[PDB]
């Protein structure tokens, strides 16, 4: 589940033309676009069905920013491995936006979809690294130390 050759091992043939990624909080996602009928699936599960039911709107933000035309022809297949439930929905959004960017990247029109998406939501395109810190001796956490008995 951590940065292995898993990125391409899931699909044999059915060559995808556009490759994109979305990775946050150890949850890494690899997104492969075949540009067919525009439908999006993540981990074999259609994007319209997402396990958190409130967090389907977070996943459908790239799609909500641009019109149906952009996603009318872009068929995306996504594969999120590792991290956690919430880090996986956050990862999905980053990968879908890298996929639209990759379709119009050569033209100066890449700028239009980067501005609109980013202005509505930061991290729709970018990925905030915020990695976890390390426990140090004398404490149960990086910022937490055990209660001192005297003084």
């Amino acid at each position: 589940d951590l940065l292995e050759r898993n990125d391409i091992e899931v699909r044999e043939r059915d060559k995808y033309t556009v490759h994109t990624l979305g990775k946050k909080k150890n949850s890494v996602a690899v997104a492969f676009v075949k540009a067919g009928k525009g439908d999006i699936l993540v981990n074999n599960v259609p994007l319209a069905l997402v396990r958190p039911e409130i967090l389907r709107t977070k996943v459908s933000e790239p799609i909500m920013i641009l019109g149906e035309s952009l996603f009318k022809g872009l068929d995306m297949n996504i594969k999120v491995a590792g991290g956690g439930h919430v880090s996986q929905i956050y990862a999905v959004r980053q990968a879908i936006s890298r996929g639209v960017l990759a379709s119009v990247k050569d033209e100066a029109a890449r700028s239009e979809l980067r501005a609109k998406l980013v202005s509505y939501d930061r991290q729709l395109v970018v990925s905030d690294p915020r990695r976890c810190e390390a426990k140090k001796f004398g404490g149960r956490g990086a910022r937490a130390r055990r209660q001192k008995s005297y003084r």
Binding site: I54, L55, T57, K58, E61, Y90, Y120, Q123
Partner: protein, 179 residues
Amino acid sequence: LFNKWPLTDVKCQDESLEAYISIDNHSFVPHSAGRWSAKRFRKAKCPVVERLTNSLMMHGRNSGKKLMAMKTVGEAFELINLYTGKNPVQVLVDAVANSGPREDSCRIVRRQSVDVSPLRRVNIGIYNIATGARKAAFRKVRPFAECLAEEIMNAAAGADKSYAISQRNSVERIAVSNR
């Protein structure tokens, strides 16, 4: 918010609080980690509903549980809309605006009355409304959602019954006396 309640005409009515309030930059559902703890006043640019949903995740127990909180303020929001026939976010902006106390007697022994900043009033108003619900959601029958919504409606009116309004008036009380 929750595929409903657009902030089309929802707006603040109090000028000072409006400067620190968000009624436009709201992502769908009260989520998104924007690091609004960063820099200094990133709270102003943070969706009020997120600020409210973040307050609920406190007092241990429900610590960090944003999803449960998001669906709880969604249950409260629908209760608010149904009770007042009014967009919940407009009632929310008014509730957290009236609740914030404008006069606090800090130490500055003796104590002296000092004017309260609009950000502090914005943060206390959100905080008091949750605690008004949290306290009334303990060993009681009404769910945390029904108190959070009960508190919000009275706070918009200014009815002392809301814990936030009573604490605001008690804060401004000990402030007037220790001027």
